[PDB]
Amino acid sequence: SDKIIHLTDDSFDTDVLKADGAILVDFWAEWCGPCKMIAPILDEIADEYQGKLTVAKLNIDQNPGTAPKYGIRGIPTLLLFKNGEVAATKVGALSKGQLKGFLDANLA
Ligand SMILES: [Cu+2]
Ligand SMILES: [Cu+2]
């Protein structure tokens, strides 16, 4: 959890929309089973992609305002932003290999 940015509804604009470069945002909640499975994978990816990608999390129970702005209707949802704009998204459980495939297809 040492390389994961903690987001809130209040900080989302500064931390995500005003960040330079690429940021992967995980929308999650404690009641979401697949969210728990992907959490350690996100730590691995935050290290492996350090320098090319920042990884962030937003808990939708505690910060319920942001997900509706992206039409998010299921979790986990991963949003990949580049320079403040969504480039690609993924909904649902995925393996480490699927996550790396998603990132490699969207990051140089
Ligand atoms: Cu960590
Ligand atoms: Cu918090």
Numbering used by the authors: 1 to 108
How does the study describe this entry?
Thioredoxins (TRX) are small globular proteins of about 100–110 residues, which are conserved in all living organisms. They participate in multiple critical redox-reactions via the reversible oxidation of the active site CXXC catalytic motif1. Two TRX forms were described in Escherichia coli, Trx1 and Trx22. The former, called EcTRX throughout this work, is a widely used experimental model for investigating the molecular basis of protein stability, folding and function.
However, in the E101G mutant, an interesting case of structural variability was observed. In this mutant, an extended, non-sequentially continuous region of the protein backbone presents two alternative traces for only one of two monomers found in the asymmetric unit. The widespread alternative-conformation region involves residues: (i) Asp10 to Val25 (including helix 1 and a half of strand β2) (ii) Thr77 to Val91 (comprising strands β4 and β5); and (iii) Ser95 to Leu107 (involving the complete CTH). Occupancies of these conformations equals 50%, and no clashes or packing defects result when alternatively occupied segments are assigned to different single-conformation models. The RMSD between these alternative conformations is 0.65 Å for the backbone atoms and it occurs without significant changes in the radius of gyration or total accessible surface area (data not shown). Structural differences between these alternative traces are explained mostly through rigid-body displacements of structural elements, as a result of changes in dihedral angles for the first and last residues of each segment. A well-preserved hydrogen bonding pattern is found in the CTH of E101G mutant, even though a Gly residue is highly destabilizing for the α-helical structure. Consistent with our previous report regarding an increase in enzyme activity when assayed using DiFTC-insulin12, the rate constant of E101G reacting with DiFTC-insulin was twice that of wild type EcTRX. Given that a negatively charged residue (Glu) is replaced by a neutral amino acid (Gly), we suspect that this difference in charge may alter the electrostatics of protein-protein interactions modifying in a subtle form the interaction with EcTPx, one of the natural targets of EcTRX, or with the non-natural substrate DiFICT-insulin, and concomitantly the EcTRX activity. The alternative conformation observed for the backbone of the E101G variant conform, to our knowledge, the widest region with alternative traces for the backbone reported to date.
